[PDB]
Structures are given as C-alpha cells and as structure tokens.
C-alpha cells in the first residue's frame, strides 16, 4: 500500500542509506533533481510538479527520514546528519553528474550543510519558505497584534516531556489543519481529503515524534550552520516565498544573500507558506524555468 | 466542597458582583489587601503569605473570573472588562479607604486598568511576573538559542478554533505539570500532590476555557491599555521579578518604569516565574515590609 498515489509514469521505491531504508518517488529522464518536502507533508507536496518536470529531468522526491515512508535516522535529526542521508541517496542516482535540489520548509535544513559541503555536487537550488537556521531565526516574535506568530511552533515543537506528541496525539487532523490553514493565504486549495491523508500520514506514532525531533535539533542546526556558513554557495540559487499570509515574504530573498553569491528570488502575492499547493501553477513555472536555462532531456 | 484547603482563621466565601459569582478566601484585620492570582493556579498560591499579611491586614484573595471557584465573566475577558469586577469586590470590604494590590502573572493584566482609573482607591501596589499588556510583548522572542522562550504560550492560548482547549483537554494534568515546571527556576516545590490540586481546578471544562480566553482578549487589553497609560501610576509600587529560569529579570522593573513614578523593583536570584511557591521566605519578606511602610495593624 501507498500513502499517497503515485503519478503515472512514477515509481515507489525505497533504498538503504547508512543503515536507513528511505522511501522515494522517481521517474522521467536526464539530470537529476532532488525534491525535498517540509513539515506536516512528504513527497507528495510535489506531485503537481512531478509529471511537468519529469519531461526534462530525472525527478526524485524522498520522504525525510522518520516521515511518509521512511526510516528514522540513526545518527540524529540535526541539519548535518539528516543532509548525509539526502546527499548518499542523491548520489546513488547521479554518481557522474552533478544534480538539482529543490526543497520547501524543513527541507531547506536538512540539506543546506551538503550543499555547502558538496557545492560541485549541486547544479542549481531552488530554496523556499523557511529560514536557513542560524541567528536570524530568535528574532521573530511570539505574538502579535493580530493573533498567533508565524514560528511560535518552533518552541511547541522543541518543548520537552514529549509536550507536542502528547497534545497532538488523538487529535492530529484537528491540529494539521488548524497548522496548514494557519500558515496559508488561499485555505481553498486544501481539501478535506487531503488533509485525512497528510494527517494518516504524520499520526503515525514515529512519524508524529520524527516531525518534532527536527525542531529539537534546530538549536544544534543553528551552531552547525555557524560554522559552515563561512564558505559561501557559489552555485545558481533561487529563492521563492509567499507574499501573503503565513508567508516569508522579502526575508527568504534577503537571508539568502548573506549566503549565497548568485541568487535571484522571488514573492508570490496570495500565496502563503503550501506554494506547491496554493500557487501550483506559477510556483511550478518558475522552478521549471530555472532549472531550464542549465541543460536537461 | 473546596477545591484548596483553606488556612487556619480564615474563611472561603462568595460575593456576587454585577452578576458575576466570585469566589474568595478571607481573614485578618485593618486595612485591606487584596491579592490577585495568575494563570495555572488560583486563590491557593498565596497561602502562606496568607496568614502573615492577616496579623496586620484584612486580607482577601479572589479567583479570578471563571478559574478556581468563580464564575465567568458575563462582559467579557479584557483587562478592563475583568478589572471592573475586582475594583468591585474590594471595595465592598473597603468602601470608604483606600486598600492594597498584590498581583501575579495575568492578575496584573485584569488589574491595571482598575488602578488606573481609581488611583485614590490603591494605596500600595504590587506586581509580578507579567508584563503589562502593551506594545512590548510583540518584542519577546519565539525560539531562543539558550533556555526557552517565556510567552511563545501568548500565540498557542490565542489562537482560534480553540486550539489550546481541544488539545489539553484529557491532558490537563500532564500539561500544567509541564507548563509549571518548565516557568521554574527550584522545581522541586512543585510536588505530585500540589500539581494534582491546581489540575483539578482548571480542568474543569469551563475554567479550561476561561484560562485561555485571557490571552484571546490579550491584543484587546493592549489595545484598551494604550490609551490608559497616557496617565502615570501615583502610589508607591513594588516589582518583583524571578532571576532564574522562567524569571522576566530585568523586564518587570524597566517596564513598569514607564508606568509608575514611584516604584522600586527587585529580581529574586534562583527563582523562576512562581515566586509565592519557589521562593517564599524572601518574597513573602518583601512584601510584608513594602505593605507595611504604610499604616496597618
């Protein structure tokens, strides 16, 4: 059985990497690109963009570990142990080339410390819609004057005692579509059937407590990256945020100037944080186009 | 029944005002203070004080609206709306002098209007361990690189399709033990036995409920406050402030600097957010000598 379907043309496969059975979605041809989802989702974020971008490329989207189908990691959920798994199972499928990665929320950490360990691995990235972890991440509020904060729920999820999982537990559609309406502009895109398989999907007893061990790890992540952020990325980067609630608005674009010396971002006016979902149609155009001008099928 | 064991001398009691059943514990002789609770808790955490404020004080300790034994409010849960209760009940025991205010946490937040607005009718005030409602709580931080943020709990009370309650809801008792004790600096007061009695309490559905509509009306309080502050704070006023872990340090006195003309402030070393319970010998000396400056008993 799947969790979520498989696109035709597609194929649902797993490999071991470092002891870790990573579960992942593969089809077309040509270079590969790697697809990185984010939290309260997995590699079917990408499906839209799948089947497009599979007429050029060799398209690869993996579950991280301990969420959709994959194994929890055995070394740990910080940045720099998660980006190992990616990387060996990106270069399981293009050991000669190098690939492209794309990567949403969570994404975005757990694979920023291979590409900048790795850089000739790594065509061209394509970051969006959350912060690369370093300091800028203790400056956003707890609150604000028109309700709850957009990362309150990085405290919730680093909280100790098992506080996320045993609140959440028994009640966890109620608490992903409060979560995922909460960070969205356009709350229409998100059908009550697809909420019931995202939550089937993280309510499982290791994937519910894998979903907030990342946040456990992010202060870790945060003096990792401190240390690897001295060597700036030199490859084609580009950034896409929202431009309406729940989005990062112009913080994507200008954070990742401090990193990265070619970069060009973008800002998607009504759309929040689920640009696969809320803004499909032109998040997918400009991900293809990108990725377009660097050679493929 | 009671839901705290009440001390020797004194008595439980109700009073309605406006509508409103309110709940206190009373004792003691001359001039009166009133102490006003802080969320989590009730009436029960000023126990010990209690008894050695009533050798020189009438002393009177409510539950706030909809907490402990009280009654919800029937306006509602603002700052200004709640305090109007409070002025209320005191100056049925005090009508014709002006009486004292010790407050913690959100009993801060429901008595600052009414100190304001009845200045001739606050001898001494003093406050703890909560800022007051205005613009300076949407500067307090989500996610902190060391220990943990202090209000990232503001959003998680705040926010809609009653989020907080659906989710602690059969876990009450399990929840506060980890919200008590994660505010703390000397955990250890907080025995098994002491956690079971405040649970009970604010498990009751609508006290659940009541708890977290403070904080829905929280912007609303800020809102109100904005305007009431363009009035200085007369009386003599006292801060105190936890040190330690859970502990607003500096905050409580630079604050409430900008609300009051005569104020002194003090930061208890070791000593987290519960002060009455963490570190009772020097706060409880400290308020018996800031009250007893002025005439009593």
Redesign the interface.
Known sequence: AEEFPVPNGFESAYREVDGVKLHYVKGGQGPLVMLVHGFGQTWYEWHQLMPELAKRFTVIAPDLPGLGQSEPPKTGYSGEQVAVYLHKLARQFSPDRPFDLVAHDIGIWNTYPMVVKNQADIARLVYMQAPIPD?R????????????????H???F????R?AE???A??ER??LE?FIK?HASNTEVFSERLLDLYARSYAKPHSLNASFEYYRA??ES?RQNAELAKTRLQMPTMTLAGGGHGGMGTFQLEQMKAYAEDVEGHVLPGCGHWLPEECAAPMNRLVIDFLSRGRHH
């Open positions: 300091a991440i203790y400056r956003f509020p707890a609150f604000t004057a028109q309700g709850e904060s957009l990362v309150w990085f405290s919730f680093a909280a100790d005692d506080l045993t609140l959440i028994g009640k109620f608490f409060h909460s992010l202060n945060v």
